[PDB]
Amino acid sequence: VRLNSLALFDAGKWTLKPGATKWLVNALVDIKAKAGWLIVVSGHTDNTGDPLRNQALSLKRAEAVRDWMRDTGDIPQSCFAVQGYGESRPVAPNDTAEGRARNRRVEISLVP
């Protein structure tokens, strides 16, 4: 089960954007429906900056979404597996714009 993308990050940030909670809650409801599944949290970035820093930054966005569901959703940290894609695999053109915001995201997939 692949959950709706979570574009919750501003440029250079791994902390959640204002307005992010409503979307994290929607994802948390979907996780509560699949109790016991492996929760794979895959982080992404836009093209701006060095690709290796973007790889590191993508892992931190994945860890932040994981710790929100761990502490603000009461789910054991052992249920998650954090992943980072860096700037590879963009969903929209990275020439700044709203597309670059679409690339600063976290994809959650549930593995039975």
Residue numbers in the entry: 441 to 552
Copy text from the publication.
In this study, we solved the structure of the PGBD of the EAEC TagL protein. A sequence alignment with selected sequences corresponding to known structures (OmpA and Pal from Acinetobacter baumannii, and Pal from Yersinia pestis) showed that the TagL PGBD is restricted between residues Thr440 and Pro552. Crystals of the TagL PGBD grew readily and its structure was solved by molecular refinement at 2.43Å. TagL PGBD crystals belonged to space group P63, a = b = 75.9 Å, c = 177.7 Å; α = β = 90°, γ = 120°, with four molecules per asymmetric unit. The structure of the TagL PGBD consists of three α-helices around a four-stranded β-sheet with connectivity β1-α1-β2-α2-β3-α3-β4, β4 being antiparallel to the other β-strands. The surface of the PGBD exhibits a deep crevice defined by three loops: Lβ1-α1, Lβ2-α2 and Lβ3-α3. Among the five residues that were previously shown to be required for TagL binding to the cell wall (Asn494, Leu497, Ser498, Arg501 and Ala502), the residues Asn494, Leu497 and Arg501 locate in this crevice. Superimposition with such proteins in complex with PG fragments (OmpA and Pal from A. baumannii, and PorE from P. gingivalis) strongly suggests that TagL interacts with PG. Nevertheless, the residues forming the DAP binding site are relatively conserved in TagL, especially the residues that interact with the DAP residue through hydrogen bonds and hydrophobic contacts: Asp486, Asn494, Leu 497 and Arg501. As expected, the structure is highly similar to other members of the family; most importantly, the PG binding pocket is conserved as the residues involved in DAP interaction are structurally conserved, which strongly suggests that TagL binds to PG through DAP interaction in the same way as other members of the OmpA/Pal/MotB family.
The type VI secretion system is a widespread mechanism found in more than a quarter of all sequenced Gram-negative bacteria, with one or several copies in each species. This nanomachine transports protein effectors directly from the cytoplasm across the cell envelope and injects them into the target cells, both prokaryotic and eukaryotic. The baseplate-sheath structure is anchored to the cell trans-envelope via a membrane-associated complex. TagL is a polytopic inner membrane protein, and its PGBD locates at the periplasmic C terminus. TagL interacts with the TssJLM membrane complex through a direct interaction with TssL.
